[PDB]
Design a protein around this ligand. Structure first.
Ligand SMILES: NCCc1c[nH]c2ccccc12
Ligand SMILES: NCCc1c[nH]c2ccccc12
Lengths: 361, 119, 360, 109
């Protein structure tokens, strides 16, 4: 009567999909991506990612990229670090791209595994523990070479106003910009002036990323900016997120992927908690603050639902937040966010959620 | 009662649904598939354990085939462990404490289901 | 100035150690063995066992044997089924032994991964899904025999009174006995008469194993026995676990590794629950019943603590029970078991616990 | 007290305490290998009132211990100050990079 079949595509359209990167820290060799429909909370499928997987969706929306580590016998034998290309609609494996055995192993900050604006290169963090940036040529299915200029730096911030350029944060408190050639090798580079004091006002690595600038928040609740509208990056700050009352109750940022920018309005979203002191920079959000980056004033504050990470969709005016296991969906078309729903049990140990891309040319 | 796709999703996703009477694993219908389709990127087992379940809606008894979907790691959702007429491994194809993905190209168990064979 | 070091041995003596096989069913590719001290509940170490590991300790107490499956890329690529030999004191990997790609993938019943009494051969269940018994020669590190005569049978019951003999339960309701030669190849075999009716009174596979006989309980609370004091196994039963009051409340056995035998007394331990009916054979224990196998009568009953599996240590007169996550330790030196302690959170999803062997 | 996340020496542990895993504060559980490299934390000793350097070496080559998970962040800094950073696997350069548990090794003042 009935016959069980495979070969099926994900049941909901791409524009409904989100990706919850479950580290499964208790069993970190069985990390996976959980695919959910944000419109109704339905579980749609998953992609296995072995030991401490990282994930992104191709800018064109067609493929899912994962990065992971295998060994021949898991806890012994030869190491293979790889990028894998998966079909986004069938959730099937297509291609493995070999990496040098030094891809970053760590929690899922966005900037560890990114791509150029044009989608042509995957750009990833290496640590041996010496740091460099790895470049993967998507068309060729090849590793290009290490960006050794990025030694002593950390994380990848693509420049959305150029096809194959990105920046990284360096130990001198400035930014290194890398411009790739068509072959994925470094064509040119430049280093900014000092943006922030590493000792006195360290910044969180997560950018609030606009098309031609990026903002960063600090451990003490200051904001720094990098303008890359020109070939040379211009840096500024600090300004404070905090008014007098805020300072009196020691409000400071905290989380992992803890900020976001709504590009059309210039609204910046930040997880914040009171009673800040040394050691609280990864505390869950007591609140989300919504800052106008032009006026440099807060325009809203709402309950944080113990969130640690977020992401913003520019095309549908949404923000997702994530507390490690549950995902909250917000409408951010107005200054005050509105909670639409919560997806309970989306992961066991996730610090990263991402939308399936829509548009974005 | 014979067509889960027409039924209430919450009804078919329950361990108490009549046709799930010897399921040991995660229901595929909670894992991005349906009662009769593997979630994307998982492969049906060509072999299965079997048995009959009573349909209380129409009062008849049906042959059920409990195929797994394979080649992805554990779904983790809607775990069931029902044992009506289940027997040990000396009645092998009535037995549900083994991985019915055991002969697939990749034996990793993702989810299970209950395929209606006939009366 | 402190220095971090490796290379250390397990901190408690072998005689204190138990092995909790955690399937981690939610993440079955990261199954493992957790090693505990039963005397105080201390976690001593662990052995990773990849996808659905099985485990046993060598009879001489020196090594841990695991059985598992790997694939080159876990969820794709070539399959490798293996036995691994680990040092018991250092909890380090020593050797891989290749198996044909048909080792049983399934929950951890004891009888799926065993060894001969003399410790020279590992005896494991295969399913392709056709069943056979595989023989691994420990000294050589090789798979040496595939017992296809055991097709249609399931699980391995070693005979403790012979060096390289074991039995398996067959679809005819009888037992097949295999006697291995010193090369690990079949030297002789025999089939018993029918012991139980497969259709009408199926037995649980878990034996209550004595030196020269084994007892089995059935889905309806009967007991069957296999006497292997001779070369030919003699079978008998049923006798009922149940008296008339028991029958009125529909008591039946339930669990996985659900029985055990205290050899010095002949006491058999069985997990039981009331309101038995079709489909309740894997229900947690409401009670543990203590049966005198010579008089064929119950002597005691105690609360079951929702246990599912057990094991017995003869020389220290102990019984462990396991509910999936927690291990209960009992003193069984007297007919009524006494609860000594509970080890909470020993596993996420375990149906098998075993003592370190101390007899040599 | 050493099995508690609040023990003073554990002020920048992000991981499972090896002392709950069959090891000790300064020795890996059997069959796991120490990382040669580590992040460092500066922790306040509540007895003498002085700050000490604690080297957080991971133990490697076995799957996650799962016991006594801690996430403390005193003086911890992001990956642009790499050896003060604890959101990475300090087993990254071992023969096998699978992370088992973390030790808290006192270096000195
Ligand atoms: N030292 C702990 C680093 C860590 C936190 N979460 C993770 C996930 C994957 C790998 C490392 C981590
Ligand atoms: N059909 C599910 C079989 C099963 C139950 N527990 C297990 C543990 C390991 C492998 C299979 C199983």
């Amino acid at each position: 009567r009935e016959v069980l079949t495979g070969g099926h595509s994900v049941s909901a359209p791409q524009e409904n999909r989100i990706y919850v990167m479950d580290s499964v820290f208790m069993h970190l060799t069985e990390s996976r991506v959980h695919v959910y429909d944000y419109t109704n909370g339905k579980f749609l499928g998953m992609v296995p990612t072995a030991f401490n997987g990282h994930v992104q969706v191709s800018n064109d929306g067609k493929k899912i990229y994962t990065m992971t580590t295998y060994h021949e016998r898991i806890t012994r034998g030869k190491r293979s670090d790889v990028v894998e290309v998966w079909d986004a609609d069938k959730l099937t494996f297509e291609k493995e791209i070999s990496l040098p055995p030094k891809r970053v192993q760590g929690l899922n900050y966005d900037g560890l595994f990114r791509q150029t604006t044009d989608g042509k290169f995957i750009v990833l963090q290496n640590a041996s523990p010496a740091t460099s940036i790895g470049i993967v040529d998507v068309a060729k299915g090849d590793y290009v070479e290490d960006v050794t200029a990025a030694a002593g730096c950390w994380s990848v911030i693509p420049q959305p106003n150029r096809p194959r350029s990105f920046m990284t944060i360096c130990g001198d408190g400035g930014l290194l910009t890398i411009n790739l050639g068509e072959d994925g090798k470094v064509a040119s580079q430049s280093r900014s002036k000092q943006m922030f004091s590493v000792k006195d006002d360290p910044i969180f690595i997560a950018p609030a990323l606009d098309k031609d600038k990026a903002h960063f928040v600090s451990y003490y609740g200051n904001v720094y900016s990098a303008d890359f509208s020109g070939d040379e990056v211009k840096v500024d700050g600090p300004w404070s997120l905090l008014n007098d009352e805020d300072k009196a109750k020691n409000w400071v940022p905290g989380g992992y992927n803890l900020v976001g920018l709504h590009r059309a309005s210039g609204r910046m979203y930040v997880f914040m908690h009171p009673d800040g002191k040394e050691g609280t920079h990864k505390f869950p959000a007591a609140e989300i603050w919504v800052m106008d980056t032009k006026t440099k004033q807060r325009v809203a504050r709402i309950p944080g639902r113990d969130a640690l990470s977020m992401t913003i969709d520019q095309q549908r005016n949404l923000m997702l937040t994530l507390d490690g296991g549950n995902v909250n969906v917000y409408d951010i078309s107005q200054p005050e966010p509105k909670l639409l729903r919560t997806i309970e049990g989306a992961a066991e140990a996730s610090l990263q959620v991402q939308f399936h891309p829509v548009g974005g040319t | 009662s014979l067509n889960p796709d027409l039924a209430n999703e919450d009804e078919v996703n329950s361990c108490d649904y009549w046709r799930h009477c010897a399921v040991d694993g995660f229901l595929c219908s909670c894992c991005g598939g349906t009662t009769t389709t593997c979630p994307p990127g998982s492969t049906p087992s060509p072999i299965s354990w079997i048995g009959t379940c009573h349909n209380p809606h129409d009062g008849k008894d049906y042959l059920i085939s409990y195929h797994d979907c394979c080649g992805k790691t554990a779904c983790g959702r809607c775990q069931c462990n029902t044992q009506t007429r289940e027997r040990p491994g000396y009645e092998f194809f009535l037995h549900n404490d083994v991985n019915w993905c055991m002969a697939n190209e990749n034996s990793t168990f993702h989810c299970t289901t209950s395929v209606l064979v006939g009366l």
